[PDB]
Design a binder for this molecule. Structure first.
Ligand SMILES: Nc1ncnc2c1ncn2[C@@H]1O[C@H](COP(=O)(O)CP(=O)(O)OP(=O)(O)O)[C@@H](O)[C@H]1O
Ligand SMILES: Nc1nc2[nH]c(SCC(=O)c3ccc(Br)cc3)nc2c(=O)[nH]1
Ligand SMILES: [Ca+2]
Ligand SMILES: [Ca+2]
Ligand SMILES: [Ca+2]
Ligand SMILES: [Ca+2]
Ligand SMILES: [Cl-]
Ligand code: NA
Ligand code: NA
Ligand code: NA
Length: 160
């Protein structure tokens, strides 16, 4: 059985365009998986701490037969192989961030994975690229992406 995973991409260090292109190549090389769709790249102001560069944000649809945690292993590996370093400050800048937003209709609460991503419904930098690639999306709780984006106040997201 194949499931579409929706993965958010963020980068604000060490040439984000290069980082995101390298990540797309690496995502392609994940086994049991195929990239179905790539969003536009967006240049977004930082949420959380603001004393950092703007982000390049994007979303990808990845159809896979991997187990969710097995997909997470690959995304974490790719981040680490692209130089991601853990420092003290909460929500610091990073070379690459790969968040599993959704894994089909699944609701996952394990030590390493919480899906849907806990805060995606409150982040334009996640929802707008997701709507670009999956305008018909429905969340596990039945909420429609189109309805969220019609109703909630979010700034326009600007393309890179
Ligand atoms: N849906 C998900 N996608 C990716 N990692 C997830 C996840 N659910 C839980 N995690 C866990 O998240 C842990 C911490 O990841 P971090 O990348 O440091 C959070 P962040 O992306 O900087 O901020 P955010 O979670 O507010 O977006 C990972 O080690 C991983 O086990
Ligand atoms: N634009 C942009 N800003 C970012 N800030 C972070 S840190 C976690 C985070 O999303 C965050 C979001 C909302 C609140 Br409230 C606090 C933290 N990552 C990104 C990113 O990918 N893009
Ligand atoms: Ca593949
Ligand atoms: Ca700071
Ligand atoms: Ca994140
Ligand atoms: Ca993350
Ligand atoms: Cl980093
Ligand atoms: Na399926
Ligand atoms: Na499998
Ligand atoms: Na809900």
């Amino acid at each position: 059985a194949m499931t579409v995973a929706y993965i958010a991409i963020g980068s604000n260090l060490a040439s984000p365009l290069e980082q995101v292109n390298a990540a797309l190549k690496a995502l392609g090389d994940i086994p049991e998986s195929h990239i179905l769709t790539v969003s536009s790249f967006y240049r977004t102001p930082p949420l959380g701490p603001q004393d950092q560069p703007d982000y390049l944000n994007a979303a990808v649809a990845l159809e896979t037969s991997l187990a969710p945690e097995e997909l997470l292993n690959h995304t974490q590996r790719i981040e680490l192989q692209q130089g991601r370093v853990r420092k003290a400050e909460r929500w610091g800048p990073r070379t690459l961030d790969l968040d599993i937003m959704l894994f089909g209709n699944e609701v996952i609460n394990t030590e390493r994975l919480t899906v849907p991503h806990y805060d995606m419904k409150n982040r334009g930098f996640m929802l707008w690229p997701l709507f670009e690639i999956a305008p018909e999306l429905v969340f596990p709780d039945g909420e429609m992406l189109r309805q969220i984006l019609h109703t909630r106040a979010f700034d326009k997201l600007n393309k890179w």
